[PDB]
Amino acid sequence: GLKAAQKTLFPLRSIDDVVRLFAAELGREEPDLVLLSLVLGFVEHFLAVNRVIPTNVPELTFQPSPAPDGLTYFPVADLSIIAALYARFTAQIRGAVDLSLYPREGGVSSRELVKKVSDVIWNSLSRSYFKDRAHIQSLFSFITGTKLDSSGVAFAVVGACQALGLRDVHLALSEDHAWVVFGPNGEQTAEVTWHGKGNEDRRGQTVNAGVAERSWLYLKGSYMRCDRKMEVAFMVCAINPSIDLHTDSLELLQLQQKLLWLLYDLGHLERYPMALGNLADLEELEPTPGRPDPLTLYHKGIASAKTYYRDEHIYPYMYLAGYHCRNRNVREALQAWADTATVIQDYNYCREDEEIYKEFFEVANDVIPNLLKEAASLLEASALQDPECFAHLLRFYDGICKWEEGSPTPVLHVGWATFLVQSLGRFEGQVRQKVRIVSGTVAGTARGPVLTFQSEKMKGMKELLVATKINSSAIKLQLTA
Ligand SMILES: *CCC(=O)N1C[C@@H]2C[C@H]1CN2S(=O)(=O)c1ccc(N2CC(CN3CCC([C@@](CN4CCC4)(c4cccc(F)c4)[C@H]4CCC[C@@H]4NC(=O)OC)CC3)(OC)C2)cc1
């Protein structure tokens, strides 16, 4: 329910008023995910979904304030609007789940209870809507339009469990999928949403098969297990400032940035690598005085992945590579992509890993070829003269090759082979042969660049990659075999 400590912070007439609600809620023993999700969804609806201020609606008002280059109008989050939305969600869940039929074995939720709550959210959703549609992530979307995206369903099941008083059910997250963790010690797992366009319904099952398979989608078991404070962080990361494909809401960007600094200062981003990359992206768009630089924050994201997730995360390095690409730091961008491939090499490319395959396919066959083409234009009256860039390029392909090893389906096809030959060809023979590709001589220690290939394909190509005249057919045949 909604208590006086929560209600007295209403109405929310500004960005700072919303931040104050979150600061107060994060200080409570059990932060209300439902209330916080509804507020974000309410403000996102008028700032990005439908910006046209309503004429025939009398209770709904907007708050004017000076905009940095006339006025800007903020949707006033009234207590009557939010409390009614909150009451509707609570009434729906409590009315559909009869907790007398489920024996709570000393504050522990059974699989049967978790599956019922999952079924309630699932059966409430609209029969037909676009899944990749923007702004269908919040509980406002579930209540006002019965639409939720893939990870939104997972968050809604967790929100609904908290409303029923189930403190043991928590959000589990990978870098592209969401499920729930429950039971004593939070070692019990259950699928609550779908994944992919048409990849069937594994709802109600454990994630064991996906973890044992070594797919990037289940991160070999080193996935995030959220506490209530991390579920608030997920919800803040989930804020979508997009108005259309090319424009953003300046208020939603400012709100997400302020909310991320709030979570950071309380230490709730310490185990959330992608939130730190998101904050760094926001800091580059609008730096806030006295705060650390985007580069410091990207490396804080990588450090978190290394410390708490045994360096098995892809996107922290991807975020850093993104920064260097935008700023045209060819060496530093290629280094970060090679570091991404060093992570993916110990995974097996499975059917449902399309999201990360598409990301690597685009860097290897569009982004990197575009970078080296632009660099070649600049040489006609520098990075292509650096043998370190060439070593980063080879380590990147080494990672993709090793990733393909032990995989049920191939990664590299004729489409990749062309861009490898073209990218190798962007570096002169003299620059390419400066790189020493060694296996090592002695193991351990007693009391031009150097590179070691972990993959069979790049090892067999060793001499060809360094030869003055590139044998295209042989390099293409070995990469695609
Ligand atoms: C020169 C620059 C250039 O051309 N390019 C091309 C691209 C961009 C730039 C550099 N390259 S790149 O190196 O190939 C590259 C860099 C960075 C990224 N991205 C990070 C990104 C995606 N995040 C991953 C997490 C999601 C998540 C939604 N997913 C997307 C499909 C569904 C999600 C997270 C976890 C579990 C999930 F099930 C889903 C959302 C759901 C709600 C919260 C969550 N987001 C966060 O946690 O945010 C921190 C989206 C964010 O960020 C934009 C793209 C890719 C390539």
**Ligand 1 atom showing the smallest separation from residue 275 Cα:** 49
> Could you tell me if 410 and 365 are in contact, meaning their C-beta atoms sit under 8 angstroms apart?
no
Ligand 1: distance of its center to the CA of 43 in Å?
A: 23
CB 389 within 8 A of CB 383: yes
Question: Could you report how far apart the first and last alpha carbons of the chain are, in Å?
Answer: 61
Ligand 1: distance of its center to the CA of 9 in Å?
Answer: 33
DSSP 8-state class, residue 217:
G
Ligand 1 centroid–CA 181 distance in Å is: 23
Reported in sequence order, the residue ranges of 83-231 that DSSP labels E, i.e. its strands, are 170-173, 178-182, 188-190, 224-225
Backbone angles phi, psi at 266, to 5 degrees: -85, -5
Experimental approach was X-ray
Task: Please enumerate in sequence order all residues whose Cβ is within 8 A of that of 344, keeping only pairs 6 or more positions apart, or say none.
Answer: 216, 314, 356, 360, 399, 400, 403
Rounded alpha-carbon distances, angstroms, from residue 5 to 2, 37, 80: 8, 18, 16
Where in the chain are the domains? 1-481
> Token digits for 308?
């708490």
**What are 6's two structure tokens?**
């929560």
Cα-based distances in Å from 115 to 155, 164, 189, 261: 14, 14, 11, 35
Measured from CB, residues less than 6 Å from any atom of ligand 1 are 137, 150-151, 173-178, 234, 237-238, 274-275, 278, 315, 318-319, 321-322, 325-326, 355, 359, 362-363, 367
Q: Determine the 3-state secondary structure of 55 from DSSP.
A: coil
User: Which residue reads 């073209």 in tokens?
Assistant: 422
Q: Smallest Cα–Cα separation from 47: which of 138, 158, 149, 175?
A: 138
Give the Cβ contact number of residue 41 at 10 Å.
Answer: 25
Cα 196 → chain centroid: 15
Nearest CA residue ID for atom 32, ligand 1:
176
In single-letter form, the type of residue at position 382 comes to S
H or E stretch including 66?
strand 62-66
CA pair distance 387, 30, nearest whole angstrom:
54
DSSP state letters, 126-143: -SS--TT-SS--SHHHHH
Integer Cα distance of 278 and 286 in angstroms: 13
Resolution in angstrom units: 2.7
Nearest partner of 425 among 481, 459, 460, 476, judged by Cα? 476
The two structure tokens encoding residue 391: 């070593």
Return the half-sphere exposure (C-beta side, CA atoms, 13 A cut-off) of residue 124. 25
Beta strands in 383-460 (DSSP E): 436-437, 450-451
Residues preceding chain discontinuities in the chain with C to N over 2.5 Å: 69, 381, 447
Q: What is the DSSP secondary-structure string of 293-359?
A: PHHHHHHHHHHHHHHHSTT--SHHHHHHHHHHHHTT-HHHHHHHHHHHHHHHTTS---GGGHHHHHH
User: Judging by beta carbons within 10 Å of its beta carbon (0-12, 13-18, 19+), is residue 299 exposed, middle or buried?
Assistant: middle
Contact of 169 with 109, CB cutoff 8 Å: yes
> How far apart, in whole angstroms, are the C-alpha atoms of residue 477 and residue 439?
23
The half-sphere exposure of 226 on its side-chain side, counting CA atoms within 13 A, is: 27
Residue 117: half-sphere exposure toward Cβ, Cα within 13 Å? 32
Q: Which atom of ligand 1 is nearest to the CA of 177?
A: 38
Kindly report the number of other CB atoms within 10 A of residue 471's CB atom: 14
H or E stretch at 210: helix 208-212
Contact 326, 362 (CB under 8 A): no
Question: 33 and 86 in contact (C-beta within 8 Å)?
Answer: no
